[model samples]
Target chain A: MIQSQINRNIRLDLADAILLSKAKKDLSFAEIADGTGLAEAFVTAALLGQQALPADAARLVGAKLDLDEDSILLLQMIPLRGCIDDRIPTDPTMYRFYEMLQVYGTTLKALVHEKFGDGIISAINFKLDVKKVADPEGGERAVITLDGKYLPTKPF
Target chain B: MIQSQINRNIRLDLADAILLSKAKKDLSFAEIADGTGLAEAFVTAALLGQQALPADAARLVGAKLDLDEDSILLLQMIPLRGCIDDRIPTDPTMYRFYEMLQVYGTTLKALVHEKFGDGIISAINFKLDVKKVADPEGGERAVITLDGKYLPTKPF
Candidate 1:
């Protein structure tokens, strides 16, 4: 049976095992995502435990990482879904995202309200992609896209 | 060209339309989640644009809500991933989560660092569930669990 978690520990423990196996095999996330027909980000997130893997992808990755049946099964279960430990993230890469929210959270909210009105923006009906683009000034910039549907609050 | 957004508006607009349709049918979130083989919270998150749906699940929900092909395709794309409009959420339910982070974010960080050592917990390797258990005192309380993996930062 597919079991769900009420505590964050079990899945987290499995993630640690995945990371260790990944390091042992010295596999890049790209390598793991190769035949999955899913984005590197999505596959990476699944291996890391923020998302679930489809059966085929799970078996493929499991074979590569030499994961046991139980572990692979765990990968196929739906995840709890927040990546940050808290409201703020301490890691540099992840922290940048939190910082983005910090800097623009209110602005985004205001603009969304101004343009979209009282309803909240839907995060479920959404798509995310990250690209490395040349910055006009110098170094490359990570251009991330957040596309989602907006759900209006309706009075019953 | 496949476009990416720095701002979250396009998808939010679509979500509003989805909500209108759902309301027109008087469909509950549970009803939409039915037969999707996913949890209600996950289905709700996907519908709200915070997450993406697998193709099959997307088709099922889309059929129920009468979503177009383009919209159904959009649902399968990975999301940008943050749900709260700002650093804090205004909605009571989502707000409680932010509040939990506010009160325990630092504590969790400290504990994780101490127990797991220099590693960050993986939200990507995570799962969440919300349960309505009877409160011994009176009404009911929500038991939301956040499960994730721990990834240690390695020195090069």
Candidate 2:
């Protein structure tokens, strides 16, 4: 049976444990991902209680981070999802994203309709990336890419 | 003079106006954006009450959409943002994004920290785009771009 949840309590709690453990090891998400054949961002999100890692990655991460057997098992459960903040983020870094969506979210809807004709983008099948590049002006910039398949809003 | 708002009522209401008028005229957001020298996504969001538009573009959109003078003025106000849904989205198209973030959001924070040190990607200095490209799998995909400047979380 597939275990899924809607509340953040248990996984969020477990997340804290791994986060604490990872901290104790003087390791960041990238370091933990070193032998997992996973991206740093991905490995971090798993322990942070976002996605459920596949069994193979889970055990490798578990072994690297000193996670107990039961803890490793818990990583396979589907998370409750989307309880990150109090509807709005208070953390400066996270809040920036909230505001970015606030500003341009409607445009997202319009573009979808105009280009794809009344359909929604797939979140179930998606990939995320945030990369840094040098700005032509002087400083650095971040290009955050959210690639999702176009799923039609079919009429029944 | 600059006017900013925190409530969505006024603008959300205004959004209905442009949207309805848009529907009546057999026009959608891209048409409104045609001469505004702005992206289709951007012009739509302006009427949808996200970002404040500059005077020149506002008039062009207003003229095209049959918006009254005051309504055009309203377009320039800094809107109270992030009031799109009930904290979480109920609409399918919108909800997918909320879920995507939930599943991969923690990765965002991790990458930000590892790459930039303790800091935030700026939302104020940001832009948005959603373009559709042919998928190799035989359909289409939406490439949603969120470009923002990275700002350091400095100690004051």
Candidate 3:
């Protein structure tokens, strides 16, 4: 659910960075703070979507990064906060695992509910297995396995 | 993309409760370390899942808490990292926003492609709107809006 500033309503198609001018400019936290007239910590937090950057600061970043007005507004919007730390995982293998966790965290939960009745695998009662898949086609693949028993919630 | 960790693997469960017991007992880190046969730092890390608690430790916790093996195992699993830290307006309201973002982030690109003929939003160039909706229920609801321009991939 993407939130649109223009109509002040929920929307989609506002979360993908499909085409951004990657004008590589060396920007330090201090430099961003000075240039945008924002606290360095606040700017960093804003960029990570933890907090909203001020209007003037958003505009300064937009100008610096060649972002249009919509982008600037989006930057100022209070974002859904917190997810892994800022250094985005670059390794394809690790990214795949992370993405799998995300998809399965949602879909698998639903599936487990449908198949096993209304109960959850006590993550507290879970185990993991990680190994290298012997593949003839290419690079070594990481295979991870999980096992946990279901626990039913007490109902009145 | 379900990764299975069967066959050769490591599994930890609350049943081995030496660590949790030690933590609860208020024993010195060093004293707890000797009983648990774990390093002081290692015991601390195990509590957070940064490291695995030894088998004996897992059992102690399970036996003490009446936690089943399955639930104990689940405890060892790493959860999907990332969540909003605080509730600005309210917890439920913030949760809804997070759920929306999670659902859209993964699917928005595809939906946009279907509608707009193979293009994506410049997430870097986006917008958002927030509003307080009038409702007859216990309380009014908050609504959010989002909009972004399409950025298509160039044909190679």
Candidate 4:
């Protein structure tokens, strides 16, 4: 139910395999995520080695991607998390998210501290959702929401 | 294979269930992570709703916690990353990490920009490991490493 890996390479390697299979089968992530009762972002992250898939979901995608048992099993394993191949993202879509953090990380910290006082926003007890909204004067923009619980730091 | 979730409450609800089970069993995080071959922090995070568990690992913990199949299945679902509840951390240990980011966020950005140029370090394609090391002065300290690949940001 919860086998964790000390190393991330194995799951990552499996990710590559899943990608290849996805490509070969000409399957879209949305297609894979359909009926899995999960959002596209979470499922996409899982397939990319950032998260894990439930057995049923794994089986569903496996059927679509023609994955083997071992691969399906790998999908069920707990991943090391963090999806960028390296420290920084070269991909344009992914880079934008990093940029948001780079620009707002400090501001967020200040606001959090000011509003909450000596506490931190939890990455745990969090919620993330991405929406493609119409830009006022041009192309669509990805509006991502990062909602989490505010946990106050207290003295022991 | 991946499946995403539109809402985070489902998994979070499952996390609460796991915690209840764990408390009922009087199990420590260490005992749960012992044979998983993964770091305790990683496993703990997964158990707490910030990470996902592998099939085998899920079963192991399920058995110990007396979790039902549904609970085990939830363990394997890809999670919405970030452990802080509601954008802030109440737990002292987790808050320290947020504080580290708060104090060093700007410095880290500057250094990253200077050293790597426009590109950003990925939390994805990253490695996180924590070890409890002796702080020569007296008490113990956690030595957490965030190793990631450097992906250069390039204009499309």
Candidate 5:
């Protein structure tokens, strides 16, 4: 039977090991995801403890990341799906996005109300993409996109 | 002169008023932001306590939102920024996005490293956009975009 975890340490520990292995191998995310039959983002997320990999993906990714049997099994289990450090991330790379959302939180809420009525943008059916593109002015830019289904709240 | 706030209560209190007035007047975000000389999202964000509006915008949005003079002044004060949960959001809508990022954070970090080298994206130089679009599969989709400049970590 499939399993779920309330203890965050289970997946977090595996995630740590995965990172160590990936670092030791000097593997790129694209390389790690090449044969996973999933998007690079999705596969990478699973290894980071935010998603549960399907049996195939879990095995395939486990193999590429050289994860141990126990580590692979943990990747298949549902994660509690909390924050990166289980708090507002202090890492600069991640903190900026959190800052963006905090800065725009109400604007997003207002726009959601305006565009979709009383409801939410569902992440369950969501997809994400990031691109490196010319800024036209000078340096490169990170163009990130979030695609999610809009689920309206019930009035009843 | 610009002022930053350490307390969350002041802005949050004003946010409550903004919402109440908005509901009473049946005003949409577009309406609240009208004549504010700023984007609807930015102006609405000011009211929602995420950001400080400029003098022109604060006055305009303040009047429209039926805010008091003190509140209008407060609208121009830099806010304390952090996710509501500070850990993991419990609200479904917020949590979904948080979870979305949690799952994909590593991928993002990896991609940034690959594309921009070891560094961070600057939220200070960031902008966000959200749009409603028709899904080919039937139903509406939220197309959210995050655009930011790359700020690399120091090597020296």
Candidate 6:
């Protein structure tokens, strides 16, 4: 049941297995990405336990490995999706999304209730956009925008 | 680059894809899980925009399938291994695992700072356990315990 939940485009190798084991024990995709300066997606793949890393990246993965001669060295496999609930996010980006959804969901729900007795936004028509908004502080803050038409339940 | 982050056993079909697209716009896994009584894993899968869902779950997902099945299914396919940073979780559990790790990590950091003069936990060698402990209250609360032996930086 657990294994069947994943789909991969590349064949997993020994290095991937090792990385997966490490991910199971320690290091989040975000943290690994931070250390390696790679995108979370790449780090996630390594953590997912697929393919070996290129020589340069292997050291950054913070894993122990032997000298190997190969082109297409795998740095990381994509980590599995939906591994944790919204209580907290393993990745900083995902965590931000989780929190945003919570606060926004509540606000949307309240607005929908006000507009139409009590109901929800049409899940079918939802749209999400994450963009960089200029912040008064310093670096840009990610601003997630959500838009969905309201859907009211039918009367029995 | 985007397609590489998945590492799991689940495949997202059309239904999951559609749900994820909508969820990407709004709604968190926890909110959806709470409203639909689905596990957080299932909800997260719905939002990842990876694959589609079976007929039964499609109705539960209740999203606009026409717009974006890919995104919806992708969201749902993400895996759920360590609920938190360094804690292992059981089949039937809530957000406690993640919560415990936060508290434990902080305490560990503080202890290490005091003793070893400032260092972090060896994320590589971490262990987690989950079991039901008899609660003084009516029902039992799922108790999670974590123990990680500290590893000091090797002498350079």
Winning model by DockQ: 2
Model 6's TM-score against the true structure: 0.29
Per-residue lDDT of A11-96 in model 3, one digit per residue for the tens? 12332231233225644434555777554445644553444667888787667666667777877776654333232334332233
Lowest summed lDDT over 10 consecutive residues: which window, candidate 2 chain A? Answer: A98-107
Please provide, for model 3 over B1-156, each residue's C-alpha lDDT reduced to its tens digit, 9 standing for 90 to 100.
122233212322231353456447654433433556654444433443333445676565445445567655544554322222221213332223333333222323223333343444432232232233343433333232333344454688
Tell me how each candidate scores on DockQ against the true complex.
Answer: 0.03, 0.62, 0.03, 0.03, 0.57, 0.02
Q: For candidate 6, what is the lDDT?
A: 0.48
Q: Model 1 off-target regions past 4 Å?
A: A1-3, B1-87, B91-156
The sequence of per-residue lDDT tens digits that candidate 2 reaches over residues A1-156 is 298867788888998888888889888777787877876666777788877888999999899889899889989888876646666667777767766656666667767877898889997666778889887877788899888899887789
- Over A78-145, each residue of candidate 1 has an lDDT whose tens digit, in order, gives 86655556656666534433433332343344334434445654444433444444445443333334
**lDDT (C-alpha) at residue B76 in model 6:** 31
Q: Model 5, range B17-124, lDDT digits (tens) per residue?
A: 888998898898887777777777677776777778888888887777778899989999998765373545666666666666666776688778877888887787
Across B26-47, the per-residue lDDT of candidate 4 in tens digits comes to 5688898999887887788788
Each candidate: what lDDT? 0.61, 0.79, 0.41, 0.77, 0.79, 0.48
Q: After superposition, how far is residue A13 of candidate 3 from its true place, in Å?
A: 6.3
In order of listing, the candidates' clash counts read 35, 0, 47, 49, 1, 64
The regions of model 2 sitting more than 4 angstroms off are A1-7, A83-85, B4-7, B82-86
| Poorest lDDT segment (10 consecutive residues) of candidate 2 chain B | B82-91
Quote the TM-score that chain A achieves in each candidate.
0.88, 0.91, 0.40, 0.90, 0.93, 0.40
Q: TM-score for each prediction?
A: 0.51, 0.88, 0.33, 0.51, 0.84, 0.29
Candidate 5 local lDDT, A35-97, one digit each (tens): 878987787777777778898888888888787898888888888776466556777788777
Chain B alone, candidate 5, TM-score of: 0.93
TM-score of candidate 2's chain B against its reference?
A: 0.92
The digit string of per-residue lDDT tens for model 2 on B117-154 reads 78887877777788888888878999998887887876
Candidate 1 chain B: 10-residue stretch with minimal lDDT:
B96-105
Can you tell me the DockQ of model 2? Answer: 0.62
Against the true structure, whose TM-score is highest?
2
Candidate 6 lDDT score at position B103: 78
